[PDB]
Structures are given as C-alpha cells and as structure tokens.
Amino acid sequence: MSELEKAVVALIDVFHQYSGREGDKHKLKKSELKELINNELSHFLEEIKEQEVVDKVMETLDSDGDGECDFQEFMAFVAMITTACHEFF
Amino acid sequence: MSELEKAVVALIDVFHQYSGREGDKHKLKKSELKELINNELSHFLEEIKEQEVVDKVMETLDSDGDGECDFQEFMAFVAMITTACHEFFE
Ligand SMILES: N=C(N)c1ccc(Oc2ccc(-c3cc4ccc(C(=N)N)cc4[nH]3)cc2)cc1
Ligand SMILES: [Ca+2]
Ligand SMILES: [Ca+2]
Ligand SMILES: [Ca+2]
Ligand SMILES: [Ca+2]
Ligand SMILES: [Ca+2]
C-alpha cells in the first residue's frame, strides 16, 4: 500500500478502535469521542476535560441528530482537522 | 505522533507531492490528479488510462468550478474513497 492507502485504512482502524468500546459498536458516543480526541489527537487538539466541551464537539459533528458520531460524521471531523492543519501551514 | 495524526499529515503530504508538479503549486490539474490516482491509489482504484475518465473524475471533484482540484476538494475525494473502503471491509 502507498502512504495514502495506509492513511485511508488508518482512519477506518482508528474509528473502530473507539466506536467498538461501548454500546453501538458502529458509532462514537460522547465518552468514546472524548477518548479518541484526548488519546489520538494530543498533538493537534487541546485535551478535553470538560463535559461541556464534549457536548459541543458532538453537537457540531452529529449531522443526523442521533446523538452519536457515525463513520460518515467522523470523516467530516477528519476533514475539518486535516483542512485546519493544512491551512495553518 | 499517533496513528490518526500520521494519517492526517499523510493526506496533506500526498496532496502536496502532486499539486506541486505543475502550474498552481496548491492545486491539482488534470495531469496531476491522474498521476496521484495511478501512483498512490493503485491498490484501490482502476488505473486511469483515458482522458475521458480523467475529465470525468475532475468534473466530479471540482466543486468550485475552477477546473482543478484544491485541497478541500481533495479531502472530499478522500472521504469518498475511505467510505467506499469502509463498506468493503464491512
Ligand atoms: N508528515 C508531515 N508533513 C508532518 C510531520 C510532522 C509534523 O509535526 C507536527 C505536528 C503537529 C504540529 C502542531 C502545530 C500546532 C499549532 C497549534 C496547535 C494548537 N492546537 N494550539 C497544535 C499544533 N500542532 C506541529 C508539527 C507535521 C507535519
Ligand atoms: Ca460505540
Ligand atoms: Ca449521528
Ligand atoms: Ca499543480
Ligand atoms: Ca476546484
Ligand atoms: Ca475551493
């Protein structure tokens, strides 16, 4: 696999590392999303320690309004983070 | 960096590697897009061997109508591919 193909597969891997921890194994509930952000984006995003900030991130991400973040919604999150990083540089 | 962080920067790296070849260093023209797909997506997508196919992929990706694929448009392409790959592994 190329570096791009590996990156694609990594997005899938990381999503499932967190979505499968609790409840719906195909979606990130708030607790899972918080853990993903604190554990996997510690060099890009400030550590989340407030429940408020959890609720806001999720509210931003939850396009279909079911209260969790599914894969499509997570992809939108990755695009936000990636675009932000790109724009920074 | 984490697995996810490495993935994020890989997307930016690969886009820069091809967008910088010709003309606007911050956008992919048709030839650059063809080269990225053929060289970096060779395990995922059928090799592009015809102009009609290149034209079509670019038209699909070119949301802002400027004839090229910029980073945000490329990110949309990555989302498409990743979603397709997700369904495959599922
Ligand atoms: N493959 C590459 N191209 C590549 C390789 C290694 C790289 O290392 C870095 C990773 C992350 C950052 C970084 C800047 C920054 C600014 C503000 C904030 C914030 N949230 N206040 C967080 C931030 N994190 C810097 C360098 C970067 C690219
Ligand atoms: Ca879950
Ligand atoms: Ca949702
Ligand atoms: Ca270019
Ligand atoms: Ca464009
Ligand atoms: Ca644009």
Under DSSP, is residue B32 helix (H, G, I), strand (E, B) or coil? helix
CB B81 within 8 A of CB A8: yes
Q: Does domain B1-90 have CATH number 3.40.30.10?
A: no
Nearest CA in chain A to B81: A8
Q: What is the DSSP letter of B69?
A: B
- Alpha-carbon distance of A17 to A84, in angstroms, equals 24
Indicate which technique resolved this structure. X-ray
- Alpha-carbon distance of A75 to A22, in angstroms, equals 20
Reading the block at residue B2, the tokens are 């984490």
- Alpha-carbon distance of B84 to B8, in angstroms, equals 18
- Domain boundaries of chain B, sorted by first residue: 1-90
- Alpha-carbon distance of A19 to B66, in angstroms, equals 38
Tokens 């919604």, located at residue: A73
Resolution of the structure in the document, Å: 1.7
For the segment(s) A1-89, the CATH number from 3.10.580.10, 1.10.238.10, 3.40.50.720, 3.90.1300.10 is 1.10.238.10
Tokens 């997307």, located at residue: B11
3-state per-residue secondary structure call for chain A: CCHHHHHHHHHHHHHHHHHCCCCCCCCECHHHHHHHHHHHCCCCCCCCCCHHHHHHHHHHHCCCCCCCECHHHHHHHHHHHHHHHHHHC
- The response to whether residue B13 sits with its C-beta less than 6 Å from ligand 1 reads yes
- The response to whether residue A82 sits with its C-beta less than 6 Å from ligand 1 reads no
Nearest CA in chain A to B86: A12
Tokens 């959890």, located at residue: A54
